[PDB]
Amino acid sequence: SHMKFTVEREHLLKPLQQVSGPLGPTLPILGNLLLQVADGTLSLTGTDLEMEMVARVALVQPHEPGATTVPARKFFDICRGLPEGAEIAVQLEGERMLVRSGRSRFSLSTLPAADFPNLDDWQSEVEFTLPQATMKRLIEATQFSMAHQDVRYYLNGMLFETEGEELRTVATDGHRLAVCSMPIGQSLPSHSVIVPRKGVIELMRMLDGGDNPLRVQIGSNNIRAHVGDFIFTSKLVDGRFPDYRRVLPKNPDKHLEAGCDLLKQAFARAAILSNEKFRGVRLYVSENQLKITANNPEQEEAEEILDVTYSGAEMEIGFNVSYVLDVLNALKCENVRMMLTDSVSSVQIEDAASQSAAYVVMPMRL
Amino acid sequence: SHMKFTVEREHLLKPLQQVSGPLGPTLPILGNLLLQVADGTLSLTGTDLEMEMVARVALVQPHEPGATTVPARKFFDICRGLPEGAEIAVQLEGERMLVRSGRSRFSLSTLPAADFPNLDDWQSEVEFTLPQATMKRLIEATQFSMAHQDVRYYLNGMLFETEGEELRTVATDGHRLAVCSMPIGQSLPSHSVIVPRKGVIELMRMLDGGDNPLRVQIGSNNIRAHVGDFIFTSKLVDGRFPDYRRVLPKNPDKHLEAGCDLLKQAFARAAILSNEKFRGVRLYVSENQLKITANNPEQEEAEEILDVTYSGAEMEIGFNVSYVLDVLNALKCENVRMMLTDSVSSVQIEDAASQSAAYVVMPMRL
Numbered sequence: 022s023h024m025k026f027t028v029e030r031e032h033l034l035k036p037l038q039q040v041s042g043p044l045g046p047t048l049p050i051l052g053n054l055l056l057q058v059a060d061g062t063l064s065l066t067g068t069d070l071e072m073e074m075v076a077r078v079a080l081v082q083p084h085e086p087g088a089t090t091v092p093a094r095k096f097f098d099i100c101r102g103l104p105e106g107a108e109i110a111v112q113l114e115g116e117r118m119l120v121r122s123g124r125s126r127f128s129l130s131t132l133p134a135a136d137f138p139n140l141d142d143w144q145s146e147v148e149f150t151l152p153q154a155t156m157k158r159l160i161e162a163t164q165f166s167m168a169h170q171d172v173r174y175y176l177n178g179m180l181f182e183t184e185g186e187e188l189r190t191v192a193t194d195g196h197r198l199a200v201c202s203m204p205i206g207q208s209l210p211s212h213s214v215i216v217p218r219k220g221v222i223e224l225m226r227m228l229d230g231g232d233n234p235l236r237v238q239i240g241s242n243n244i245r246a247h248v249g250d251f252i253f254t255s256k257l258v259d260g261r262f263p264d265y266r267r268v269l270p271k272n273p274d275k276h277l278e279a280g281c282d283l284l285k286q287a288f289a290r291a292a293i294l295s296n297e298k299f300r301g302v303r304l305y306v307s308e309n310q311l312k313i314t315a316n317n318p319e320q321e322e323a324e325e326i327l328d329v330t331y332s333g334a335e336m337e338i339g340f341n342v343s344y345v346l347d348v349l350n351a352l353k354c355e356n357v358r359m360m361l362t363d364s365v366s367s368v369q370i371e372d373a374a375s376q377s378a379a380y381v382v383m384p385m386r387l
Numbered sequence: 388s389h390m391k392f393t394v395e396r397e398h399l400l401k402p403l404q405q406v407s408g409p410l411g412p413t414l415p416i417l418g419n420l421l422l423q424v425a426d427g428t429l430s431l432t433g434t435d436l437e438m439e440m441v442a443r444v445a446l447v448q449p450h451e452p453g454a455t456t457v458p459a460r461k462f463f464d465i466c467r468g469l470p471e472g473a474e475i476a477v478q479l480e481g482e483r484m485l486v487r488s489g490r491s492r493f494s495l496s497t498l499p500a501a502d503f504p505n506l507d508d509w510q511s512e513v514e515f516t517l518p519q520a521t522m523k524r525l526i527e528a529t530q531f532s533m534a535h536q537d538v539r540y541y542l543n544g545m546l547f548e549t550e551g552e553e554l555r556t557v558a559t560d561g562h563r564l565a566v567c568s569m570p571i572g573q574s575l576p577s578h579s580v581i582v583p584r585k586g587v588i589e590l591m592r593m594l595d596g597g598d599n600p601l602r603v604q605i606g607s608n609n610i611r612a613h614v615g616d617f618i619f620t621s622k623l624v625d626g627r628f629p630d631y632r633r634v635l636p637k638n639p640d641k642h643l644e645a646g647c648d649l650l651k652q653a654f655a656r657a658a659i660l661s662n663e664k665f666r667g668v669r670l671y672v673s674e675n676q677l678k679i680t681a682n683n684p685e686q687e688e689a690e691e692i693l694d695v696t697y698s699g700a701e702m703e704i705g706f707n708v709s710y711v712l713d714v715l716n717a718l719k720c721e722n723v724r725m726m727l728t729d730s731v732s733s734v735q736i737e738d739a740a741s742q743s744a745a746y747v748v749m750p751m752r753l
Contacts, residue, residue: 095659095687102656124692125656130685290468290491293461319496321461326490 023113024087026058026080030100030107030122036076037097039251040067042226043074043219044093053090055137056111056118060086067093068138072220072255074227088134091118099127140254145238145245147183147212151205153228153235153248159190160225162201162378165347167218168194175260178217181244183209191265197344199351200265201378214239215262220255227251268381270369273360277306278330278373281357284311285349287325291315292342294323301385302342306361307335315342338364339387345370348380389479390453392424392446396466396473396488402442403463405617406433408592409440409585410459419456421503422477422484426452433459434504438586438621440593454500457484465493506620511604511611513549513578517571519594519601519614525556526591528567528744531713533584534560541626544583547610549575557631563710565717566631567744580605581628586621593617634747636735639726643672644696644739647723650677651715653691657681658708660689667751668708672727673701681708704730705753711736714746 037054044067046052055066063078100109103122110121113131120127160179168176171194180191186209189202216224227248228235236247245254291302295315305312309332313325338361348370349357356373364387370380403420410433412418421432429444466475469488476487479497486493526545534542537560546557552575555568582590593614594601602613611620657668661681671678675698679691704727714736715723722739730753736746 098659099656099689102652102659104652125653126688126690127656127660128688130687286468286470287491290465290493293464293468294493321496322492322494323465324492 022087023085024056024058024089025085025112026063027082027084027108027110028063028078028080030103030105030109032078033100033109036065036078036250037093037100039227040065040074040076041093041097042223043067043069043072045069050090050132050136050138052092052094053132053137054093054096055088055090055134057088057134058084058086066137068140069219070138071217072223072253073138073140074223075252075254077250077252087113089113089118090132090134090137091129095129096120140243140256143240143243145240147210147239148237149183149188149205149207149209150234150236151188153230153233155188155203155205156224156235157228157230159188159201159203160221162351163190163192163199164221164225165351166192166194166197166199166380167221171195173260175215175258175262178215178258179221180213180262181216181239182211182213183239184211185209191262193263193265193268195263196341196383197347198263198265198268198381199348199378200380203377212239213262214244215258215260216244216255217258220244223253223255227253265379265381268367269379270360270362270367270381273362273366273369275306275333275336275361276331277311277359277361278356279311279327279359281349281352281354281372283327284329284357285346287311287313287327288342288345288349291323291325292346294321295342299385300341300343301339301387302345303337303339303387305335305337306331306333308332333361336361336364337387338368339385340368340382341385344382348382351380352378388453389451390422390424390455391451391478392429393448393450393474393476394429394444394446396469396471396475398444399466399475402431402444402616403459403466405593406431406440406442407459407463408589409433409435409438411435416456416498416502416504418458418460419498419503420459420462421454421456421500423454423500424450424452432503434506435585436504437583438589438619439504439506440589441618441620443616443618453479455479455484456498456500456503457495461495462486506609506622509606509609511606513576513605514603515549515554515571515573515575516600516602517554519596519599521554521569521571522590522601523594523596525554525567525569526587528717529556529558529565530587530591531717532558532560532563532565532746533587537561539626541581541624541628544581544624545587546579546628547582547605548577548579549605550577551575557628559629559631559634561629562707562749563713564629564631564634564747565714565744566746569743578605579628580610581624581626582610582621583624586610589619589621593619631745631747634733635745636726636728636733636747639728639732639735641672641699641702641727642697643677643725643727644722645677645693645725647715647718647720647738649693650695650723651712653677653679653693654708654711654715657689657691658712660687661708665751666707666709667705667753668711669703669705669753671701671703672697672699674698699727702727702730703753704734705751706734706748707751710748714748717746718744 057064354372360369423430720738726735
């Protein structure tokens, strides 16, 4: 085969950037993109073995079928570097891939397409289509709560759950937990899968913020997302993910309400004088009042006092201020509700006007 | 003394950010800002021993004189963290400095003002006032050409030269050189001083892009810049800086002209396939034409051909493409002129419509 194609720079740029996502090499070919020309289509694939991103570009100009792999970064940089409106002529020449446009000529090293990894075939168990904005809301509400390199490898990912008419995401690191559910206007079977850390990153990356809908297919060990001309596939993670229903506090009778921004700014200032490693803050809750205290090894001290909506019993509780700030930053709302039990129990935090997302933060011993 | 002052957050923020510039510690007090209250003025000083930045804030509210030093980053973060319009009440309490606003209270560790370094007094030999935009143009045209940790320590700085009615900057690393001169509408004595790397950075940092003029004072071993309520002082560097007059090519008879952007984009694409360490490109100049070639150890190759304005003798010359790209990026102009001699001689590069800046790049052996 003698692979050859000519494509407008503007039809090649966004696909190249998208398929280079899973990249960042061990096996040399993993640093390359797979290019395949067949029946009016150029396919571009990037992989890291755990996941793959494939883009399809319609070939309107004459072309000859074939396949090769080229260095991803170099090929994208060449194409991006060319002027707006450039026509990009690509051709395999022996073991080199030539890229030509105007009087610019580039000859790239290649690796055989036969060597390019290909995820095994599988059958879909559940399928649904939803707006990209729904998927973005779900991931952004919970992504920060995923563990970082925990031994319990399932915590390094994100749980994706279908139930009734809702899609839900759950993330936890064993100290704090985030859960968000959204209706997607279709009845679904109940299914729960764990998407790996990089998989969640790529899912987010392919959401261009437009009106092209997101079609999801879930298998027993794989997930696939289709947006426009892109198809992302990832392996799923093994493990018994914790059950958010059991993590939510049973009777968090003490309800505090406050402006989200005023609460966030008061914790952000207190954080300045918290211990740099442990990040501990002390909260003292009383009638319509919250007091936040932070101190560090140098005995420096921050104290903040806020007017809040609170009428229950007085109590003191310690938290890692970064976990609290992460929740407040993810809520991006007007008012927040904190639902407390006691000094040694978790707090549930929510947007006071929406039960779509719930956050559970375990306290620290004072 | 019992230092105490109350200032509006908006009058304290920009000075705090400005005086923290020289910071980034060995001696603990170097991580602190010196605060001094005396006769309606709060002075804030930051230093790294080689340079100091001092800001003066008028104290319109009652105050008590005194001095202390506080952690720079913590104090700025507290002040920045407070709400817009906040009134900031500061007071020394024993060995702590208290910062109060609304119901926010911070108690910071201190180090004695007596321990704070103070650059020795000196007398000015030359003084001139110029627009901030003139100083910005002079530094930006040459800063990239300064050496990085060269043994010849004077190359790690920037030469500032007064001559006639002009202020000039020169920077070189022994491989490439930049020189820029601007008229400043006042007759000056001829003086040449070397400002250290960090000094050039701080000079640039204090140019707020406004109409407050820059007053410069040069001594035998120090330089000082005054902009609004800020005063920057730096030690000068020892050494015999190279003489740009002798570095400029004597008879660069072969003149090439081209669009700056087209030339830059063609070198930027060729650079993709250049050796990652050596960055060598080969130029072949012929009648109204330039050809740029780059290759790497993997035998990949880029070739660019451009229509240029050229009528002299044919020649081939090698350059480090990063040195060429640095010049083109600093010129930000419509057309560029390259003045060549031979394959083993330097090239002089200039904006085709302005002789204000000149760049000299030594070639590489092909």
